[PDB]
Amino acid sequence: NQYDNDVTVWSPQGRIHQIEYAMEAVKQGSATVGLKSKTHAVLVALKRAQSELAAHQKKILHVDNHIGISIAGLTADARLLCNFMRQECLDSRFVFDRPLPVSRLVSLIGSKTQIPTQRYGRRPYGVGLLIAGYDDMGPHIFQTCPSANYFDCRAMSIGARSQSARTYLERHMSEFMECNLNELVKHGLRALRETLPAEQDLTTKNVSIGIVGKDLEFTIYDDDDVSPFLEGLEE
Amino acid sequence: GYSFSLTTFSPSGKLVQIEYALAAVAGGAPSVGIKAANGVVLATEKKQKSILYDERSVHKVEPITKHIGLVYSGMGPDYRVLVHRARKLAQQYYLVYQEPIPTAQLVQRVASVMQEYTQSGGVRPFGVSLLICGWNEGRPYLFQSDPSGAYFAWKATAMGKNYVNGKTFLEKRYNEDLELEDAIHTAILTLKESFEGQMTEDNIEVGICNEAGFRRLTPTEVKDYLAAIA
Amino acid sequence: SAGFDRHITIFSPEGRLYQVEYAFKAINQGGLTSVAVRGKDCAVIVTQKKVPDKLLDSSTVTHLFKITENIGCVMTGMTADSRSQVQRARYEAANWKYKYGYEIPVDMLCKRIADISQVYTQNAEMRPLGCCMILIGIDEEQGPQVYKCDPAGYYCGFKATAAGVKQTESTSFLEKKVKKKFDWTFEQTVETAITCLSTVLSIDFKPSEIEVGVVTVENPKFRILTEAEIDAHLVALA
Amino acid sequence: SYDRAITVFSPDGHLFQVEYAQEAVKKGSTAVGVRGKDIVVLGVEKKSVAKLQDERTVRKICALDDNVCMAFAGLTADARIVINRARVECQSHRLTVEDPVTVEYITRYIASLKQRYTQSNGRRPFGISALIVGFDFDGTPRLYQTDPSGTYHAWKANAIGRGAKSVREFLEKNYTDEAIETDDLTIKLVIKALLEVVQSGGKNIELAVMRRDQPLKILNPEEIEKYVAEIE
Amino acid sequence: TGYDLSASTFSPDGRVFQVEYAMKAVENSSTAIGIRCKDGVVFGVEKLVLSKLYEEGSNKRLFNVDRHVGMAVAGLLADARSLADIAREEASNFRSNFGYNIPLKHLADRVAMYVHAYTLYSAVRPFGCSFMLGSYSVNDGAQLYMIDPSGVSYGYWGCAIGKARQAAKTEIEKLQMKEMTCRDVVKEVAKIIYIVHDEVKDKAFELELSWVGEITNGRHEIVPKDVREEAEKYAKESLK
């Protein structure tokens, strides 16, 4: 009530409740997952639809040839950062004539999120992000937060029922590096299987995936491209 | 930066913040001034808790120019900024018109700056009042300004604590055809009626203006005025 | 109290400012004290240095500052306010010499500094600084001078000052001491100023416990007194 | 400068600040209008006249152009700003495009003018609801009502101000197409619609009309007296 | 009565709670320590890995300010990542303008000036971070400073930041850090961090160290794992 109002208000606990409720926006939306191998990196996100007539919202976006992202949270905060992320990927080759390292790109992603936190009246972006890409050092998955901090992980299960599906990622984590293209998808499909009961399965309309790799630049496979991967594996 | 004005109207309609400023300058150090004959006399009192503070260092009486000088009763530090902008307006006057500034036109341009701070956002009104001393075109000038920016004019006036008694004491003692030297006497009499305790030359701060310009008095010539003679 | 006068800066029902008076009493929260005495050829400042941690460096932590070549400084209040306000004091003297081509006097130096602290009070935007500035130096015509700038902007020439946890008691203690009204030379100004804080605080200062800056006629450049001569002044009481 | 959110929603989704702008419209003066074929008749009743007022300044019926006039009912403050800016939009439309000011086009600018200051930071919504009347090319009558919220509509017969809901309700039964063939049918019917709030008065009422390609004309009390002479 | 609703207001006791509340975010931040020595300065970080998903090198609190300067922080982990660029501004501009390496004091000055700049207004909030800055120079040598959320700069023989300060500080006051070499003490620095550690909330963690000093010839470097394992596996002997 008193101190819950604004971002710049310091509570006696030191926490910022507007950053707290900014992280709540991740729990308020569909779960998104991503994972990487020694070379390849795969983003498998659940496409969500409000009703059964409407099609499912596509959480997977295209950033650069070697980079792609997915969001869990407020849906329109992506295209705000997506315009800047796609701009910095162009700024790289426009100057350095080479793809920008992911550590240098995500460091600029946090920047735009650092400014509104310490200034009055503004808002942080409460959507969770998944940033994966291949570079000289290989795949790097950097997740960010509305707190403006960015992490690095091999795989992440975030959104609604986030920690419930991380047990599957925790058990097979040793395999994720050894997984090939199929084994990344085999454990990528079961990654979202832990986020939904058997009554909700992985189907062409509500599920889309994407893959970036060593010699394979980032691509997006939606329905019939994943049909041999979707069908044949059981929940 | 705040763009919102800090002062709003009361249910009665009167400005609430500036109304407090009249009580701010009321509890301050009393000050006396009179427009008499060849010039205007200003007698203030500089008082501290102990003699440890020097009189000559900082003065309440400051010249705006050779002609014009000011006194104040209210918040002390708020008188600073008014000194610079005055002299700044005085020089910007002297650059354009190459002449000393009349006392009339000077106050309006200074009061307009004070009233800009009762309008623009994030700025509080002044907690100090001004008595304008100037001599122009042969006739002396004594003006009174308030925190609201309204400028007045007085043949004789009083400012600070006990102005109630002072105004009644002025209507008694004050008369016309009084010389600057005689106007000093009436100013000291009012301060003797106002200030409680013994009155020395180091407490009282006096300065005057005339055809020879605005000059601040020395402690030596005040000794003859401490005897209640002129 | 009426309205927001307890928070922002606006005139009270009796025409005062609560926020400015609050930060004025916040100077007592510094947990230290300072005093300044004007001598014949010199200006002496006796200030307290608090080093509770042996890890804390004694030399780099000081209230004694160097504003310019001929002028020193001391600060009493919040260190963040002090350390920041002193940087702007160096911009002035720099721009001063860049403008008028000579060292700024102690008189004009406190003016421009304290008048900028008034922009604080006039605005609910910027809070005032809880640092109480005390500046000394040399004006070759008038010799040494001693000033103190409150967060409100008030300043005057002081024969002696009061600062720190105990202020009103300092001037009350300086009543009988300055009442002697003898002429204090360089060493007499130093020895008498040390007696000030030593009796009130009930300490009997050690050379490492305090620090004393000085500036003189013959030495217009500011002088930092080493602990070798401090104990030489400390034995004047014994 | 000054940036702050002004217009905000309500627990039910309503606009507090905008609805209060509509409240001052109903409690102001009463203005009416009806769209005929060749001519559109406007009127307003001001009961604030103390007999000491100069009647040139009190006019709420202005002209944004030769083809478009206007009236309004509401707070008299914000009206003068819209009257000036719209006239600036007229000449700027002529300066940019030689074609004259379209009656439907000038409304969209004013509707965007209102709505802009409504939703923009550090502003206030207009307490005016203005009736914009103008004819398109080749005898095409167009009548427009506005809203402080920015939404505008068209009306064959319309009323705003005090008790105008009943005036529309009274015209709902009494307004047909057998009438309003001539200006005499429109005016008297408007005055008959004005008879709701009549105090034994109507010298308080000011009438003005615009007809086809003809320039604006304000009816004198003499022409009104002929219509006042017929009541029963 | 709402005196602390903003940092621009002083409480009737004269104490600013908002900058103090910003320190409470540092008081709840994870504990990291570093100490200067005669050869140079050593930095350290205790990183809390909550889940196995965290990759090595993630959540790195070891920062590179300049060639000869590193950084270690306590507070919100995204705070100093802005100051990282700000510290590189003075690092780049000084070498650009004045054409040589910046001393630690001159860097710790303007940064502390920038920390204090946000305590002023009500339209910004002060930094929720507190950090220390060491370096090494030929004319100066190892120096150690720290900037609190209020922007205050002090010289230190040793310092501690984060959750528990005096827990390490008192132990650092017991053991003499003055004439010892950073290569010898880097084993004991980990032991002090392990003493600060307690298992109730926090479970597992890792140590992150950095190099600057005569061993590196003044250029700030990073410690390899094996040389740290020499301290780690020795700290395991001193773990009990």
Next chain:
Amino acid sequence: MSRRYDSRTTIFSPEGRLYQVEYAMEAIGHAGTCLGILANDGVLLAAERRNIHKLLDEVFFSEKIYKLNEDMACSVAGITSDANVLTNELRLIAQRYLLQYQEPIPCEQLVTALCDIKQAYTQFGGKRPFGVSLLYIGWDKHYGFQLYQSDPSGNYGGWKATCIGNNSAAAVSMLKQDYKEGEMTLKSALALAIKVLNKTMDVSKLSAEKVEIATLTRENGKTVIRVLKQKEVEQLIKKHEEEEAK
């Protein structure tokens, strides 16, 4: 900007009214009683000075009777503060008309130009409104003699007669019965004004140091603004002392 410290002057009331603007409507009701009379051969403005004291200087001029420009003058009822800021900005805009068009500004164009400044505040900018009410008299090349009355909200309008300041309401009641529309003249407006004043004036004795009246008369093709000296005024006061009973 925060929130709490911003009082939101531009927000409507639940009744669809403006608090700050209506507080100024009452604020000018506590101001100096002032009235004006539109006549055929001239126009005048009566203004009571709220400061009546012996030590007052009173050497300059009527003090709240000012001169806008060659054409027009103005009275003042309200807070004396914001009245001085407007007169400067009025002369600015008034000279900008004469700058480009090389004509003296008409009465209507000058009033509608200032009222946009008042409405630029109540609408936006966040600044507080004005607590000043002003009367506008003057002659123009078109409409001739004019009498206008402004307000804090920015609205205005013409008047044959009107009163502002203290006891403005009851002063109109005497103007309802006594005043003849359009029949009055400059010399006859003297008796008409003071006859309404002496009853509506709360302080008796009817002295020139209380109310000081100025007139505006066009002469030799040029508008002339004149202030009657206390001598002639006290003669007109003694004229009312004759016309009160005798």
Next chain:
Amino acid sequence: MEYLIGIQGPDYVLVASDRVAASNIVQMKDDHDKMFKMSEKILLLCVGEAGDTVQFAEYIQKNVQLYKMRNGYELSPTAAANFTRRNLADYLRSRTPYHVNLLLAGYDEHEGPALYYMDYLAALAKAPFAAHGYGAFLTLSILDRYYTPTISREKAVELLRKCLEELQKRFILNLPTFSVRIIDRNGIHDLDNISFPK
């Protein structure tokens, strides 16, 4: 160069101009209208660089219409001049100074008809007659001969043609097509455009 001429009578102002606009060695259009209607009783002409004439004219023309809406009454000829000059002098110090030679005509409600003269240097001179372009060399000497302040408008039309036909007899340009408009108490009226039946 294109030519302008105007004459101020006691109750009237008569203006005449060439309608031919040319470029290079050819005349593109002979019907180009120089005469612009500013307001009811006010009318304006201009000559200069081919593009600046129409460009600068509409600004001064439409800005007067904005005044007529606010106060309800149109500007006087005197007010239009000084408002045109100061606005024309401001464009000189900009990057694109306009080459302008114009004639301002209007009927005041008191002074009646008025004629004003300005140049690309923005110098306002009140004169009963003025000319522009190269024709000002071969024409204005004729006016001083036959002109009187009391001249009737029909004598002006006669003497106008005597000044105009001089251009084909001597001056090198053709300029056959001329236009005529006049302002009086009743406002703007039109007369037959002067042509030359070769």
Next chain:
Amino acid sequence: YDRGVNTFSPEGRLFQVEYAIEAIKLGSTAIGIQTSEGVCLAVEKRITSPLMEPSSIEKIVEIDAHIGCAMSGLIADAKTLIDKARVETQNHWFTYNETMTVESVTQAVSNLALQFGEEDADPGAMSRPFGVALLFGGVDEKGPQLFHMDPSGTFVQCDARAIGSASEGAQSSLQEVYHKSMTLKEAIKSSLIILKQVMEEKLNATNIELATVQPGQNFHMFTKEELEEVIKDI
């Protein structure tokens, strides 16, 4: 009062965005439908008074030859976005000399939708988000696609959606009535059956609007002429 527009709820929602949905539920009811031949957009005018001309309120405007626009909820916020999308289409056409796809048109609307804020903004900033609902149909090389948008700017391809006050009873029935590839003109008459059920008034010819689009035909609004044949089957 005592809150900002950027303040998150205890449930993690934007305040003004929460009530932006409640503001739409007071407006007119529209239902879009996607099919093979095109996208059907039909909305009842919701006449608020008999004296109002039905041609005054127009809820269907044509931005692109094959792509139309709709209006729901707050009426004023649409005319602000009407020009914004029309600028984007011509700014795109002036650049690449080609027509923008229907998917990218919705991308430009959400860009200007989140520009609202207070601090660190421009003079053209918005205080509150747009309370208007948008249904964008159109046909291109990608095929006919129906796009449903919310106040927060979220847009997705949709088979059928119900917006407005009557959406509740309609949306539950739209799941029942709409099936697969059923053609365009069959979805027009099947909608009016449910529209007649959900509205509180009687169905009239000019009380509703009907406009569709085909692959080889421009988007066209249908006047009362064809509406007589529309209501002819009921």
